[PDB]
Design a protein around this ligand. Structure first.
Ligand SMILES: *C[C@H](N)C(=O)/C=C/OP(=O)(O)O
Ligand SMILES: *C[C@H](N)C(=O)/C=C/OP(=O)(O)O
Ligand SMILES: *C[C@H](N)C(=O)/C=C/OP(=O)(O)O
Ligand SMILES: *C[C@H](N)C(=O)/C=C/OP(=O)(O)O
Ligand SMILES: *C[C@H](N)C(=O)/C=C/OP(=O)(O)O
Lengths: 272, 271, 273, 272, 272
């Protein structure tokens, strides 16, 4: 099954950190720090927030440079609904497209039909219903997003707890009430049932938004994520190389408080 | 094990706990006679003035503060950020303050404090909040006003609310306590324990706005077991003298002659 | 060990049973012969209270002694919410359970009876889990998950059974760290919420009540996971109370046997208006 | 002081039941039942409610017939603010005037200045502030009223719990907060302080309103009242003679469940 | 009676001007100008308004200096509800504490229990009910305040007229309506009656707020005050020494238009 193949590709990222990079130098830093993949974008989310202006798919020249600089998978963001941007990214050989809300919405009413592509897609979500709608559209991996570019995990905690609490609610829910639940969260019933049977999201689920410290990243993992995205927390901090390695080690050893303490020690300024 | 942590906190009764952001402030607080220090990144008046996300202190700074003093060292963690508290426990702080002056990490849940071996401080504005924090595992309650304003008005409000509610509860008809516990959304058993003790089941300190010795003795005369001072000492003109004066005020809070003496010639209070 | 757990233990005997409202000894005797596990003595059945209005109070003790004398199964009696003196009287005349009931006229809008002060067990009503746990903390030994009394419409009982059980299933799989906030949100005592989480069920017997008019209704309550059903109006406001009472009892005894449900429903005559 | 003498007169009624009577026959029934006093009025509160129309002080003729019929004290109702009605009641020798809200309000803004009278007054209240305001006007006894003429104790339970909860609040209140409390309930501070010091109301406190059964009456006594008024529950019931004695016995033995059970047995129909 | 003694102390200030001083130089100026007392505070009210920031009891060192610099009585402000601040002021020997609204409220729900102190207190008020509540708390002198630090008498005129008009209303009020009046203004009935019997406030009443010119001060006196407070009008004006003497003479000769004209002539800039 072509979708299950795409899902399997994203499973290989479990336990990893994906780092936003806007040039090839940042891409090397992330790979050396132990990132499982990099995300090519025009500006990290904290700069998109402070500066404003329309944010689009990165120039294919920049993506090519980042692909050449690393051997780990390379993701790239496309505007929501901008399926031509995604066609271009697939054509130049990115490994994943992130149909991303940090870029400027291109279609306020529809997402990309991700089934028309060979490579897997990441989509964001704030709740289970959103996650399942993205998956029905063909998303092979889900980013449970908070607020990008603020260094504040509070919304990612909210959305991780919301998605996982809804899954747990679903696990023990009376079968006969699942139809109404699927109407209530506006999700395809088959995907709701698959989630109930698995007891987890049918695709990999990473946290994203405001992860600024190793404590934050391990928090996301102890809350039940398969990995984390860091967009601004590394490359807007005082010591990106050391913070990047620290966040990777936090995610690999997310239950080991002594390791979390050690990698957090003497880490310099987090992002503003 | 929870009563062990509740008992530990008893050793701070009668004391002043002082916020410190580095080892120099920590030694000043100990020499002034503070019963413990509270390590945080910025004093609350600076967090309020400057904005920005405020998190747990870097472990390196906490280790520095631990090595500078021999009185208990507390540290702040963001509400709900249980991994920050795991780290603070792993580096050997004596108390975690799950603190509202830091940027909220979980808007819906506090830390499950029963999963830790060290005692936790939590803030409250009323009795129901205090009892909820205690049921989560807090061993000590900070009855908080407004952090970083030098204005005790909200601390006075919340101390009178908590203690007024405890006094209400003490004379309350037993049959009305069930509805009372619903009304303040508190665990009934802890409500009953408060009624039977006649005081909060854990140590209760005032915090927020304590700027002068008179403020500090005011909190004690309103029936607190101690006071936090976050900004009043180190945002003031003479930190070393004000810290000793606030400590002496809390130790001698009913002695107007002493209160007048230690307040004399104290310099500028915090802005 | 504790006196409360002894009362809770005693109520277990009622699992699988039907408790029928009776207003005289004739009704009580019919209920016992139909196989009811207990009767509920009250002044008027809920449909009559609803239609007639007026203040509804504890039954006259003479009525209760007549009902106790007529049957050997347990006798329950209704007391107004908050009216602890009515309950003291019911206890002194030897009823087996007091139902602190919303079908009677509320006597204290702000407090329920302190049921821990009594030796005999109490039933209390609830619409949701928080209500149930607050009643249990006050000392209710058994919970009646109530819909609308006297209407013959199960729709609200279904709502409240699904609500209580939905919340229990929600609780069973809930992340432990979220239970403190959950206890606050439903305004329930935390220890009882945790106990409910651990057991996967209500810590006391849970019956459905309100609007159960047919055997299908009763068996529906049982298939939604109740331990038993109250029938107040559906039996004695119907056209054939004796046949209907046996049918509902059989429905609760054999609630998964559709052939039996079909059988006991056949020719049952008119249900309540 | 003259006021404390009046207050002492009403103390002699502790443990008693006061019954509303509209003629000498009812008054004799009440005295024989053991009532500590009777309350002369034109119509029992249940009739005033169902019938409407202006309700005033009883005709002095009817009051004289009631005084001739009994030797226990005779009370009579006067309209709120109607000090001339009270002057008349005093001139014909009633023992207490009840400035009563079950009669038609004569002055919407002022109560009778009860210090200008030699005999003691009863006033109603819903909360402690009302009681203390009535007492400052010269009320020697407070009746804590619910809904008169409905046979429903719910509002009297509310008001008894309100007054008593306020007094218990006041007993443990910080002395410095009492000034603001007296402002909040709009009550004379000296009477608030006196209530705090006594731990109870500075005058006798009876329950009234909706007491229909012996259980109701004993309920009021167990809630902390000194006695009960019964306006409608006796003479609108099926068996007033038996019910009046049962209520009296209930109030005398209000903590004895076996007695309460016994006197409640076979009591006939309560009021509608 | 200890309260009547405190009241008698404040009577000696009748016909006087109390001047705010923030150092010993201002205190001498006020005494030489003929002030009956000085008020030690950290900043005059016009500066507290313009600058903001929390305003507390003056440092006891400053109060000591002001006490040493003058022989007339020395008052000091404490924050409303800050009874420890008042304990300190009593301990260092001020003659009066002003529980003052120009300082930052410390207890939004309660004032200081002034009966626990040996020295008399001043409190502010905007209306009779406030004045009487402060007096019940133990205030021995009342400051009928307008708007401090604006130089605009309009609110002090409003509040002086309000207090005096309410007293005049009370003077001629039907006795039987006084109970309801005391509820309406939320004042202790005994104090309301005392005010009605005296025909004036039971303690000394000074005006305060916006008194900027000798005309203003004499206005307050012709409206019926026993004296005036000047906080900003002297020491924020162009010629404090001359304006201070002028305001004192205005208050001493408040009905003598020729004197008011003379002392107002050539007075330089009033406060901004
Ligand atoms: C969309 C991108 N992959 C991402 O995860 C952004 C995160 O925002 P930040 O809060 O800057 O980590
Ligand atoms: C949370 C911290 N320990 C604290 O007590 C803050 C006090 O606020 P401040 O107003 O700065 O004393
Ligand atoms: C309170 C009584 N036990 C009861 O269950 C009422 C049921 O209502 P109905 O709808 O009449 O069966
Ligand atoms: C005012 C009269 N004495 C009285 O107490 C009325 C009671 O009302 P009811 O509900 O008729 O007892
Ligand atoms: C509180 C002080 N005693 C005072 O009277 C303030 C007056 O204000 P101003 O308007 O500046 O005279």
């Amino acid at each position: 099954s072509p979708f299950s193949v795409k899902v399997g590709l994203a499973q290989m990222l479990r336990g990893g950190v994906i780092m936003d990079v806007v040039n090839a130098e940042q891409a090397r830093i992330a790979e050396e720090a132990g990132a499982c993949a990099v995300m090519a974008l025009e500006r990290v989310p904290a700069d998109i927030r402070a500066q404003g202006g329309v944010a689009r798919m990165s120039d294919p020249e920049m993506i090519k440079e980042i692909k050449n600089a690393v051997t780990i998978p390379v993701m790239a963001k496309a505007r929501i609904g901008h399926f031509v941007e995604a066609q271009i990214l697939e054509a130049i050989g990115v490994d994943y497209v992130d149909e991303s809300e940090v870029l400027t919405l291109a279609d306020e009413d529809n997402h990309i039909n991700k089934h028309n592509f060979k490579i897997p897609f990441v989509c964001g979500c704030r709740n289970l219903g959103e996650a399942l709608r993205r998956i029905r559209e063909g998303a092979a991996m889900i980013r449970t997003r908070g607020e990008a570019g603020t260094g504040n995990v509070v919304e990612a905690v909210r959305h991780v707890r919301s998605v996982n609490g809804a899954i747990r609610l679903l696990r023990s829910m009376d079968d006969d009430e699942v139809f109404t639940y699927a109407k209530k969260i506006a999700a395809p019933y088959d995907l709701v049932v698959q989630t109930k049977e698995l007891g987890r999201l049918p695709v990999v689920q990473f946290a994203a938004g405001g992860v600024a410290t190793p404590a934050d990243a391990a928090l996301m993992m102890q809350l039940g994520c398969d990995g984390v995205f860091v967009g601004s927390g590394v490359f807007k901090s005082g010591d990106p190389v050391k913070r990047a390695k620290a966040i990777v080690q936090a995610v690999t050893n997310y239950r080991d408080a002594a390791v979390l303490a050690e990698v957090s020690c003497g880490l310099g300024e987090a992002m503003v």
